[PDB]
Design a binder for this molecule. Sequence first.
Ligand code: CLA
Ligand SMILES: CC1=C(C#C/C(C)=C/C=C/C(C)=C/C=C/C=C(C)/C=C/C=C(C)/C=C/[C@@]23O[C@]2(C)C[C@@H](O)CC3(C)C)C(C)(C)C[C@H](O)C1
Lengths: 166, 62, 222, 69, 37, 217, 220
Amino acid sequence: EAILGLTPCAESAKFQKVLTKEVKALEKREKLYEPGSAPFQALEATKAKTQARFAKYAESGLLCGADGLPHLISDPGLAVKYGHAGETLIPTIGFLYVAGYIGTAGRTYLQEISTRQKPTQSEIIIDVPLATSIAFKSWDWPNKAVKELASGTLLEDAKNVPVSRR
Amino acid sequence: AGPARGSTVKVTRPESYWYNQYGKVISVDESGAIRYPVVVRFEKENYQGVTTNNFALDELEY
Amino acid sequence: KLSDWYGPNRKLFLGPLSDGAPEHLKGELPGDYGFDVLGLATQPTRLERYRQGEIINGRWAMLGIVGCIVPELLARNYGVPFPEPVWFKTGATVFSEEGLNYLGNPSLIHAKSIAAILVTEILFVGAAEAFRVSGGPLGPATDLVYPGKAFDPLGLSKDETAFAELKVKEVKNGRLAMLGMLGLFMQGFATGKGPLQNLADHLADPTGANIITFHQRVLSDL
Amino acid sequence: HTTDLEDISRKVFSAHFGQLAIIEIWLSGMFFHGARFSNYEAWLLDPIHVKPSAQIVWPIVGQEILNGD
Amino acid sequence: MKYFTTYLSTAPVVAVLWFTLTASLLIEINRFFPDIL
Amino acid sequence: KWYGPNRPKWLGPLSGGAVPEYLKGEYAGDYGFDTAGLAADPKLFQRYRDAELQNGRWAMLGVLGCLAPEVLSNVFGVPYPEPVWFKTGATILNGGSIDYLANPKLIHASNLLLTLVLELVFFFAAETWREAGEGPLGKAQDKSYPGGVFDPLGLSKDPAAFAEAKVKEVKNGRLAMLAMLGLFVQAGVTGQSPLENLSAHLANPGVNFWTSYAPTL
Amino acid sequence: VMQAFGTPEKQILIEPVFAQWIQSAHGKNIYELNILLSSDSSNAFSASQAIWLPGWLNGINDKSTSLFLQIGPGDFLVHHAIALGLHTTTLILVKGALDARGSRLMPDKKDFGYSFPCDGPGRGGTCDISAWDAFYLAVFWMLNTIGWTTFYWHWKHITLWQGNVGQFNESSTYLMGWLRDYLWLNSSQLINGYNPFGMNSLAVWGWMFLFGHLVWATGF
Ligand code: CLA
Ligand SMILES: CC1=C(C#C/C(C)=C/C=C/C(C)=C/C=C/C=C(C)/C=C/C=C(C)/C=C/[C@@]23O[C@]2(C)C[C@@H](O)CC3(C)C)C(C)(C)C[C@H](O)C1
């Protein structure tokens, strides 16, 4: 469905122009080699991939501009109403899960070693068992996050936080 | 009163690196002429690279 | 001596590189190479339950792998008339017309109803498992994994040291068999052929039939 | 580290051997890339027209375009 | 080997190893499932 | 049904060695079942207890909500567009609306993302109050068993009846969880409604089984 | 890297839908969004005593005027660059003003004043610790940020006025486009202002162009 003045890539002539332009370049390169030789095969693999890629973009409801290149929709309302949520909105959730995981693993390891005798030695020599255990137990990180938040164990109190003369 | 040797204090001197942080008491001087009798040791070194400092009683929370 | 497999001088999984073992794996268990990278056995209750678990899954795997191999072995290298000799296809053969006939021979069992097989399995194996845990007709449940009265007729577990070496031999044969089984599952998914067909294709063209070739084929079908 | 000039000399001499080892790996690499991923035997027939090449790129993420003619 | 694993546990070795695996994984995904936009 | 040291257990009469030590019959639904040792840590056991009750109560409302609009369409003539549970949802897609009791003057909802966002926001509030154990609706008596506004009939006032009813709740919860897992797998395998699945096994006890779908794998 | 590998279809080209919505509300009908002044049936449009509206709508839907230029992915990227510059300039200046009286590295900064060199190599070293130094640092960021805004304004107009708005739409999504189709291309006449053949009236701007290069470099 054409929105925001954009055409769907599946029914855009400029899209086809682009595909033609890439495939023609590859043909020109192929002229130099012999139809059985291994460079030839490489250029054929390249061309195959190329045509496949354009076909994929065509059956994905991507939206082309005047340049004939696909454009992404980032307002979540527009994305969900017109079937474009896979462009930005799903990746959002995907990034925020993995970033929360990495944070949780890092915070966890740091809070664990902080109770050791020399905690700074465990920062330059990683406790690898401890780190692997933390990395694999941290797949359900919102458990820990919402617990820490609602309980109050997420934030240090202001009285315990070093601060300047203000 | 003084803190006990080995006790934990919180610095309340605003110009100090260790403000709002906790240190161990190592020594208290008992003379009244001394202006900063309590010696405190901290885990985190300051920008100078030292880890100890003298304090008065009115700059500690014990 | 039982020292290459027990105590602080045991052989560990990283070989020469090994500079010690985790603390929860003390070397008081058979097959302790100090391998607990994900630290699943850091609690002692879990380490007990997973010890039993490992041995039971192992034993069942050893019976499984043998059961999964041999009716293919007869049907190929001996010529026993099995309808569907491949283990993952067997089981639909109770919904055939000739049924489940032991060794091909149509008078040997001739099962047709899955309801009877299921109900007898639930009863029989339900009993046998509940006895295993709580104790039953064949003795008390003093040891949960090594009973040894009725279940050691040849008196093999009497010589202490030999018992402690055989213990390690059990676990290690059990581990091999669990990897073998896992291999049967994945090769089943990958190839859609039977295990000994796979072994035949490997033996025909070793380079051009393996898991690398398989991944290539996947990649060629995009 | 030390004040002893003997200990320093020893470290220097031994570090020098390590530098020669890394140089030798680097040369061996150049000869290997020349034997296995080059057009040296083609270039030897036609030095004027064939352009020397001894680094191939793997096809991934579109980088194969760097494998020129 | 008696302290070799502790050397492998140090930060730049663990970093090189972790990035190499993480990179390798992303390369292999981008071999199998290319051109995700 | 009970507590204590001589309660019903999960292997029945043959449940001598089948009980771990940490399950001492203090909490509802202790049949001494924990073969993977998950509850050996007692903080983890408190967590899991809350989780088992959250999954259960949600599973109960779920199974009632997956069946009710199908029943209303079947029994009464309520004209739901796609009344099956795994087909509801798609009604709000395209240009279609969601009308409660198939009446287009009732909710008439057409904006999927506005629906979802309202749900997450409402839940972010209510779940944060749940986890804290204090909120607008009051302070909880127990994390899993809040009481107050949540118990308007005062059925938790009697101690023994409360102790029984905890065992009723956890057992209905477990059943409902197995029901819901049933619904999911049935839809995944048979591709038909769960009332059609029941009708098919009521009409014919025989072949109409999981062992009509098993041969195809 | 997508342009370099010959695959422009794999660029990330986010539409600026929130700015296109605002433009739609003002009366531009190129985005087919039909709201407020771009809907005929709205209260805002049909406000009886509006009367500025016919003039306004004529203006806003005329390509020649710069009254709400059309925008796309190239516009999205540069607006985020400008945002980066505004925030980063603000951060340097706000830190300057809020750490003016003191910090942890120097708790008595107010006693030295606005401008002083440093507090010596002690405490790890203290170059550029005064509030004046924050200002000095912020001026580079401010020149960079107005640089980015004027380069965008210029290239966007130069392409609109020549007619080839495609040039800006295509090239502005990657940095070699700015370098090649803006800086490199539009410097051709300037650097020919005086040549071995002769000189034209662009010779003063030619010379002032190299003079600027020299004065900038002398500052380093
Ligand atoms: C446990 C690791 C960890 C966690 C949870 C955080 C969390 C945060 N950082 Mg910090 N930071 C970290 C490490 C961490 N950081 C490190 C290692 C550096 C040095 C490069 C920084 C440098 C830094 C700066 C300069 C800023 C932040 C800021 C922030 C805050 C906002 C989010 C952000 O800006 O991300 C950005 C994160 C980075 C730029 C650093 C990348 C962190 C890596 C990818 C993850 C940790 C790596 C670690 C080695 C993992 C080992 C774990 C293993 C042994 C189990 C947030 C509180 C910002 C802030 O103050 O917000 C108000 C801010 O300006 N961080
Ligand atoms: C205890 C124990 C063990 C165990 C265990 C077991 C058996 C665990 C099993 C857990 C299980 C099986 C838990 C399912 C929950 C399902 C829920 C929450 C359903 C909600 C459903 C809801 C809220 C929503 C329904 C709908 O949205 C749907 C779907 C579609 C819509 O149209 C309609 C509505 C909105 C109504 C081990 C591991 C075996 C050993 C260990 O040692 C001890």
